[PDB]
Design a protein around this ligand. Structure first.
Ligand SMILES: *[C@@H]1O[C@H](CO)[C@@H](O[C@@H]2O[C@H](CO)[C@@H](O)[C@H](O)[C@H]2NC(C)=O)[C@H](O)[C@H]1NC(C)=O
Lengths: 64, 42
């Protein structure tokens, strides 16, 4: 409870990892034609946040 | 009573009981079933 923060044609990509209790997020966005499955090509994700949370994650779930 | 003790930068605030032996303690304190926190004798 010790933290709070506030800020098919579209493909969004993310990476989530937790290290030294910091939680790190990276992302990228692009329009696409090959909507079936991940388009073969290359584009690097870049950092968004580095949250100082100190939490013991082993599961996740998406929110629709 | 306010001042107490039991990866890096962890913060395990859980009060859940020690199974200090093989007992299914179920929050019942007793021999081999102990509450994890203690207050300092200040
Ligand atoms: C995640 O929870 C575990 C217990 O479920 C915590 O485990 C202890 O972690 C410390 C270092 O933080 C170790 O010295 C102990 O040996 C661990 N105990 C056991 C029984 O293995 C842990 O602190 C929690 N991690 C975070 C990041 O909060």
């Amino acid at each position: 409870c010790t933290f709070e923060y506030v800020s098919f044609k579209n493909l969004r990509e993310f990476v989530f990892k937790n290290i030294d209790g910091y939680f790190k997020i990276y992302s990228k966005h692009t329009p696409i034609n090959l909507v079936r499955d991940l388009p073969q090509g290359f584009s690097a994700l870049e950092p968004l946040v580095d949250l100082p949370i100190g939490i013991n994650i082993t599961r996740f779930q998406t929110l629709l | 009573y306010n001042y107490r003790y039991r990866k890096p930068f962890e913060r395990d605030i859980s009060t859940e009981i020690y199974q200090a032996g093989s007992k299914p303690c179920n929050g019942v304190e007793g021999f081999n079933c102990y509450f994890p926190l203690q207050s300092y004798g200040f």
